Amino acid sequence: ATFEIVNRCSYTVWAAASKGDAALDAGGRQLNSGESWTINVEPGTNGGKIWARTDCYFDDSGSGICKTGDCGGLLRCKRFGRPPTTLAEFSLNQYGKDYIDISNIKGFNVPMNFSPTTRGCRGVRCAADIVGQCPAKLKAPGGGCNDACTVFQTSEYCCTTGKCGPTEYSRFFKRLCPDAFSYVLDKPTTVTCPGSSNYRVTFCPT
């Protein structure tokens, strides 16, 4: 499957693509404002994620640091990124279908649209100014809006027991972005697409 990753932000981002235990494609690349990077994701990929990283520095070997979404200091991510990260999440060719969503469960750093480029389903979008409106207690000093689990480490926020409800913090994410997950047990906003669809992830869609 192809994923065209497009940076419409006015700032550079470093795109990242991983399934947690391995890179997807090259795993990461710089995207200056307006640039597009097309990756190939193996069919059957389960639990893939794409995100943006901000304010990154890499040496000639591809080692460094990002303020948001850092994946073990690598340009080419092999693992998931450090919150806060708005997440484009996907599982492909799962009993003949693809499943896509956006999640704010690991916080928000950059607004995102995640849409098919092929027929048969709709896209999802989280493009509100979550950083600007972020509750004081969730503001990440390194940049972005943390989720409550990252900040407070409670069973309730982290859904450790598989019993948890919405919270004042999850309702903030859900108010600003109804079509993204706001907490682990949120009413799903997953979209079912035909198996082997292709996609575009657009940072800063509006």
Curated annotation (Swiss-Prot):
<keyword id="KW-0968">Cytoplasmic vesicle</keyword>
<dbReference type="InterPro" id="IPR001938">
    <property type="entry name" value="Thaumatin"/>
</dbReference>
<feature type="disulfide bond">
    <location>
        <begin position="56"/>
        <end position="66"/>
    </location>
</feature>
<feature type="disulfide bond">
    <location>
        <begin position="71"/>
        <end position="77"/>
    </location>
</feature>
<feature type="disulfide bond">
    <location>
        <begin position="149"/>
        <end position="158"/>
    </location>
</feature>
<comment type="similarity">
    <text>Belongs to the thaumatin family.</text>
</comment>
<keyword id="KW-0732">Signal</keyword>
<feature type="disulfide bond">
    <location>
        <begin position="126"/>
        <end position="177"/>
    </location>
</feature>
<feature type="disulfide bond">
    <location>
        <begin position="121"/>
        <end position="193"/>
    </location>
</feature>
<keyword id="KW-0776">Taste-modifying protein</keyword>
<protein>
    <recommendedName>
        <fullName>Thaumatin I</fullName>
    </recommendedName>
</protein>
<dbReference type="InterPro" id="IPR037176">
    <property type="entry name" value="Osmotin/thaumatin-like_sf"/>
</dbReference>
<dbReference type="InterPro" id="IPR017949">
    <property type="entry name" value="Thaumatin_CS"/>
</dbReference>
<dbReference type="Pfam" id="PF00314">
    <property type="entry name" value="Thaumatin"/>
</dbReference>
<dbReference type="GO" id="GO:0031410">
    <property type="term" value="C:cytoplasmic vesicle"/>
</dbReference>
<feature type="disulfide bond">
    <location>
        <begin position="9"/>
        <end position="204"/>
    </location>
</feature>
<keyword id="KW-1015">Disulfide bond</keyword>
<feature type="disulfide bond">
    <location>
        <begin position="159"/>
        <end position="164"/>
    </location>
</feature>
<comment type="function">
    <text>Taste-modifying protein; intensely sweet-tasting. It is 100000 times sweeter than sucrose on a molar basis.</text>
</comment>
<feature type="disulfide bond">
    <location>
        <begin position="134"/>
        <end position="145"/>
    </location>
</feature>
